[PDB]
Amino acid sequence: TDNTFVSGNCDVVIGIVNNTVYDPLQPELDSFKEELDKYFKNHTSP
Amino acid sequence: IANQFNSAIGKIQDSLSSTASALGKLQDVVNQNAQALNTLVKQLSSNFGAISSVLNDILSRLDKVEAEVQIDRLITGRLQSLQTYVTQQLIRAAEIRASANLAAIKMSECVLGQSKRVDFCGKGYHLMSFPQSAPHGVVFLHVTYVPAQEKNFTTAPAICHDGKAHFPREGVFVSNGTHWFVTQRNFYEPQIITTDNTFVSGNCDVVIGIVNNTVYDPLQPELDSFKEELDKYFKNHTSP
Amino acid sequence: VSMTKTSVDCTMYICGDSTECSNLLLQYGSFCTQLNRALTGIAVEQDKNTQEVFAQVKQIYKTPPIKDFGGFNFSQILPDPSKPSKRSFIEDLLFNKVTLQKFNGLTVLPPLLTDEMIAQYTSALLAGTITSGWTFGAGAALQIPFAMQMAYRFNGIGVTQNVLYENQKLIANQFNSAIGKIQDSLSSTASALGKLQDVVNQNAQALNTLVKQLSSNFGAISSVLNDILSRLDKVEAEVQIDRLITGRLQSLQTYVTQQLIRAAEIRASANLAAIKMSECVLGQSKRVDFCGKGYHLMSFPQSAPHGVVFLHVTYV
Amino acid sequence: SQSIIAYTMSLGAENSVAYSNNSIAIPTNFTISVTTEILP
Numbered sequence: 012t013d014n015t016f017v018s019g020n021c022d023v024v025i026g027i028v029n030n031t032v033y034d035p036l037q038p039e040l041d042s043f044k045e046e047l048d049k050y051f052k053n054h055t056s057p
Numbered sequence: 058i059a060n061q062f063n064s065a066i067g068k069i070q071d072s073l074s075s076t077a078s079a080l081g082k083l084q085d086v087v088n089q090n091a092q093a094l095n096t097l098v099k100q101l102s103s104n105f106g107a108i109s110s111v112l113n114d115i116l117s118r119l120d121k122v123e124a125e126v127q128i129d130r131l132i133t134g135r136l137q138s139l140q141t142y143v144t145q146q147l148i149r150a151a152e153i154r155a156s157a158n159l160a161a162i163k164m165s166e167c168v169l170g171q172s173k174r175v176d177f178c179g180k181g182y183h184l185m186s187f188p189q190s191a192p193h194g195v196v197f198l199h200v201t202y203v204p205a206q207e208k209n210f211t212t213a214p215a216i217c218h219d220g221k222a223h224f225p226r227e228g229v230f231v232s233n234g235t236h237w238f239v240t241q242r243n244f245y246e247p248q249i250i251t252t253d254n255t256f257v258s259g260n261c262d263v264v265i266g267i268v269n270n271t272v273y274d275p276l277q278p279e280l281d282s283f284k285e286e287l288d289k290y291f292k293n294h295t296s297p
Numbered sequence: 298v299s300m301t302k303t304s305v306d307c308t309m310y311i312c313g314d315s316t317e318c319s320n321l322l323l324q325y326g327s328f329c330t331q332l333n334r335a336l337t338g339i340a341v342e343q344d345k346n347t348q349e350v351f352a353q354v355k356q357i358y359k360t361p362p363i364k365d366f367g368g369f370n371f372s373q374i375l376p377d378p379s380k381p382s383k384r385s386f387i388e389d390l391l392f393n394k395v396t397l398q399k400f401n402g403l404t405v406l407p408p409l410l411t412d413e414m415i416a417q418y419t420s421a422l423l424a425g426t427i428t429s430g431w432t433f434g435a436g437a438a439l440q441i442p443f444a445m446q447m448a449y450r451f452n453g454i455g456v457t458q459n460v461l462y463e464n465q466k467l468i469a470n471q472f473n474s475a476i477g478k479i480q481d482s483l484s485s486t487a488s489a490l491g492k493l494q495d496v497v498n499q500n501a502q503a504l505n506t507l508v509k510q511l512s513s514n515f516g517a518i519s520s521v522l523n524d525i526l527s528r529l530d531k532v533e534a535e536v537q538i539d540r541l542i543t544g545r546l547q548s549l550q551t552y553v554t555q556q557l558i559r560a561a562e563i564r565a566s567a568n569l570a571a572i573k574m575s576e577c578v579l580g581q582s583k584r585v586d587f588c589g590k591g592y593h594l595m596s597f598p599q600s601a602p603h604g605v606v607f608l609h610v611t612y613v
Numbered sequence: 614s615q616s617i618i619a620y621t622m623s624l625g626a627e628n629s630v631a632y633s634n635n636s637i638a639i640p641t642n643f644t645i646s647v648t649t650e651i652l653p
């Protein structure tokens with residue numbers, strides 16, 4: 012998403028292709044879900 | 058910028074009002090036109106070896122054939138005086154044609170547009186230009202941004218923050234001697250080196266004269282303040 | 298950029314040391330002045346062409362005594378202080394590769410800028426470039442490190458600045474090798490400076506042509522003025538001498554027509570040389586193939602007899 | 614005391630440039646210049 016910009020749906024662009032696009036916000040929030048998940052697990056313990 | 062523009066057009070008024078120098082490039086064309094016709098008129102006063110410059114003072118003195126031997130000289134010399142003038146005028150017409158073709162190009166590029174060509178629309182970086190008409194010519198008022206008050210700074214091609222080499226997306230890196238910033242190449246306006254202002258390639262080993270500084274990430278303290286929000290939710294939930 | 302200034306005594310050419318030929322020349326009036334105004338007009342312009350090409354900067358920038366141009370080696374194109382004229386190494390090739398009348402009234406006037414002053418303006422433009430980028434055109438010269446200048450350059454051709462820094466050793470070694478190939482090439486080829494030599498050859502051919510026309514009879518009994526005068530009276534001499542005056546004036550009006558036409562070719566080349574000075578040296582062009590083939594990074598000017606050489610540096 | 618002086622023309626001010634491998638000059642401020650150009 013930092014290399015690219017986004018417009019409309021996929022019907023109009025003759026010769027378009029399918030692939031994944033990485034959002035570098037995502038694992039920066041996913042690590043921040045696992046940390047949070049660890050918080051809850053440890054908070055079940057006392 | 059408006060005051061400096063209004064000031065500068067004022068200096069154009071005062072300059073052209075005060076002293077009769079600048080328009081010599083038009084005057085020298087008007088002068089060569091006048092001088093060439095004036096020369097061509099004077100050539101009529103030459104004899105070309107005939108008994109006179111005055112055709113009627115040949116004709117009213119000689120018969121139909123003793124005159125020919127004179128009149129043919131005048132026809133010959135006079136006709137060569139026209140061929141010389143018309144040659145000079147054609148060669149001159151090329152100088153003016155060239156100049157006109159450049160004036161048409163400078164209109165197209167400096168008036169109907171903006172030019173990235175260096176010095177072509179006056180010295181400086183070209184903003185815009187205004188045409189003004191002049192007798193047998195055109196004057197262009199070119200408006201230009203000129204860098205005026207520089208400061209020396211220390212600089213480095215890249216920053217290393219996390220084993221990775223960072224580079225400006227736009228601008229250049231600079232140090233006031235104690236801190237590091239990124240700024241646009243043509244006007245000093247410093248910014249803290251963020252992960253938005255910069256882009257990355259490779260590792261620190263390669264770039265000659267790279268230096269070390271923090272790079273800011275504007276997503277981090279927004280998530281950190283979400284961690285401190287989260288800590289006060291977990292702590293309060295330990296409380297009941 | 299320019300050609301030899303030439304100025305002629307129309308009287309000494311047509312009529313050398315004869316009052317009689319002078320009095321017969323008066324019958325044609327102002328034509329000798331019209332010719333001299335034209336040759337003066339040419340001659341004055343030759344300074345203007347050289348002034349538009351080389352005098353584009355009004356400060357004489359000088360290179361620092363220490364050289365840390367990022368591994369690029371301008372020793373082949375900067376001044377060499379060891380020399381009697383302070384020209385560069387490649388300029389002394391140029392001043393050798395171009396190989397370059399008095400008693401007939403024909404005179405070669407000196408240029409306003411000596412070949413030393415042209416070496417100064419050339420050095421100022423080159424020192425401005427390698428230290429100060431485009432900024433020595435657009436204002437007062439601002440210093441920038443040469444590897445940083447080359448980064449801003451690569452961004453001018455749409456290439457990312459890391460593509461320089463990840464390869465700087467190779468980019469300099471290619472540059473250093475390429476400038477070596479300029480020296481080697483200019484020793485090798487005789488056709489290299491051909492434009493400049495062809496200009497010298499034409500201006501020279503026309504003066505020698507103009508002198509050889511003095512030997513022509515024009516249908517007179519002799520070309521030699523005193524062969525006519527020594528054996529004849531005022532009447533038969535006027536008939537004979539008036540052919541020589543006709544023929545010789547027609548020879549000047551020919552030479553000056555050629556030299557005017559030839560001056561417009563030099564003008565058109567000088568303005569092109571002034572544009573390439575501004576847009577290839579004082580800047581970096583986006584014009585495709587204008588400043589040599591490739592994508593343009595920068596250019597270095599070098600002086601030559603009556604001319605200029607550009608070394609254009611391009612990303613291919 | 615007026616006279617016609619004759620001289621070797623000055624090409625411009627002599628001005629060495631403060632280039633170093635890590636030094637840059639950047640303008641803090643600018644001027645807007647209007648200039649005249651005249652063509653026949």
Ligand SMILES: *[C@@H]1O[C@H](CO)[C@@H](O[C@@H]2O[C@H](CO)[C@@H](O[C@H]3O[C@H](CO)[C@@H](O)[C@H](O)[C@@H]3O)[C@H](O)[C@H]2NC(C)=O)[C@H](O)[C@H]1NC(C)=O
Binds near residue numbers: 029
């Ligand atoms: C690229 O990804 C697209 C999204 O997965 C995919 O589009 C999907 O293509 C299939 C097969 O052509 C469609 O399958 C359905 O087709 C009709 C309804 O239109 C039904 O009768 C079938 O039973 C079946 O369910 C999907 O509806 C369609 N979805 C979309 C949003 O387009 C492209 O085909 C993929 N292209 C390539 C080259 O992989």
Ligand SMILES: *[C@@H]1O[C@H](CO)[C@@H](O[C@@H]2O[C@H](CO)[C@@H](O[C@H]3O[C@H](CO)[C@@H](O)[C@H](O)[C@@H]3O)[C@H](O)[C@H]2NC(C)=O)[C@H](O)[C@H]1NC(C)=O
Binds near residue numbers: 233234235236
């Ligand atoms: C190089 O540029 C730096 C950024 O402008 C500058 O550092 C900044 O200096 C000012 C003081 O001159 C600090 O201002 C704050 O100072 C205290 C902080 O507790 C407050 O009481 C004040 O109200 C004010 O907010 C900046 O915090 C400081 N910035 C940083 C990032 O340290 C340097 O001084 C400059 N260096 C030189 C040699 O000029």
Ligand SMILES: *[C@@H]1O[C@H](CO)[C@@H](O[C@@H]2O[C@H](CO)[C@@H](O[C@H]3O[C@H](CO)[C@@H](O)[C@H](O)[C@@H]3O)[C@H](O)[C@H]2NC(C)=O)[C@H](O)[C@H]1NC(C)=O
Binds near residue numbers: 268269
């Ligand atoms: C820029 O920041 C770099 C990261 O901190 C820094 O690299 C580090 O430099 C030190 C000093 O040379 C190295 O120290 C260790 O060197 C060897 C092992 O590599 C040991 O024998 C020493 O005892 C010592 O422990 C670090 O290893 C090195 N780190 C890395 C990842 O290479 C640069 O020196 C900094 N450069 C400048 C100019 O600020």
Ligand SMILES: *[C@@H]1O[C@H](CO[C@@H]2O[C@@H](C)[C@@H](O)[C@@H](O)[C@@H]2O)[C@@H](O[C@@H]2O[C@H](CO)[C@@H](O)[C@H](O)[C@H]2NC(C)=O)[C@H](O)[C@H]1NC(C)=O
Binds near residue numbers: 208209
């Ligand atoms: C910008 O800097 C140059 C030289 O670099 C500086 O040298 C020190 C004096 C110090 O300022 C360091 O932080 C810099 O690295 C200045 O050049 C000097 O100019 C004076 C005349 O004003 C001359 O007598 C000195 O010999 C020059 N010395 C050097 C090494 O250049 C330059 O004047 C500065 N320009 C501006 C506008 O600030």
Ligand SMILES: *[C@@H]1O[C@H](CO)[C@@H](O[C@@H]2O[C@H](CO)[C@@H](O)[C@H](O)[C@H]2NC(C)=O)[C@H](O)[C@H]1NC(C)=O
Binds near residue numbers: 370372373
């Ligand atoms: C820049 O390249 C020049 C050659 O063009 C190098 O100068 C030569 O240096 C060697 C070794 O000292 C001498 O044998 C040659 O006689 C020199 N040639 C000339 C024409 O001077 C110069 O050393 C190179 N500079 C750097 C920084 O490597």
Ligand SMILES: *[C@@H]1O[C@H](CO)[C@@H](O[C@@H]2O[C@H](CO)[C@@H](O)[C@H](O)[C@H]2NC(C)=O)[C@H](O)[C@H]1NC(C)=O
Binds near residue numbers: 467471
């Ligand atoms: C890019 O091309 C250059 C040559 O134009 C390559 O540089 C040469 O690399 C070989 C080894 O592969 C060396 O033997 C030469 O001495 C190098 N020449 C120079 C001038 O350095 C370079 O390797 C190529 N790069 C890539 C990534 O393909």
Ligand SMILES: *[C@@H]1O[C@H](CO)[C@@H](O[C@@H]2O[C@H](CO)[C@@H](O)[C@H](O)[C@H]2NC(C)=O)[C@H](O)[C@H]1NC(C)=O
Binds near residue numbers: 061641642644
């Ligand atoms: C940029 O330069 C201009 C002048 O060209 C500065 O404007 C002058 O500022 C002083 C006070 O500092 C005033 O006395 C003048 O009247 C101003 N002139 C004009 C035309 O308004 C300007 O302040 C400079 N800006 C910076 C940030 O250096």
Ligand SMILES: *[C@@H]1O[C@H](CO)[C@@H](O)[C@H](O)[C@H]1NC(C)=O
Binds near residue numbers: 027
């Ligand atoms: C590209 O060309 C092939 C034939 O070689 C054709 O089958 C295909 O549909 C074309 N694709 C596009 C997007 O034009």
Ligand SMILES: *[C@@H]1O[C@H](CO)[C@@H](O)[C@H](O)[C@H]1NC(C)=O
Binds near residue numbers: 053
């Ligand atoms: C679990 O949470 C307690 C505080 O409630 C903390 O002291 C401890 O370090 C945590 N343990 C782990 C494995 O994170």
Ligand SMILES: *[C@@H]1O[C@H](CO)[C@@H](O)[C@H](O)[C@H]1NC(C)=O
Binds near residue numbers: 266365
């Ligand atoms: C810059 O030059 C100094 C010598 O003045 C040298 O010690 C340093 O390593 C050089 N750095 C770079 C990036 O070239």
Ligand SMILES: *[C@@H]1O[C@H](CO)[C@@H](O)[C@H](O)[C@H]1NC(C)=O
Binds near residue numbers: 296
């Ligand atoms: C914790 O939050 C609850 C509301 O969710 C509030 O009623 C309570 O006063 C809070 N306790 C503390 C210690 O702030």
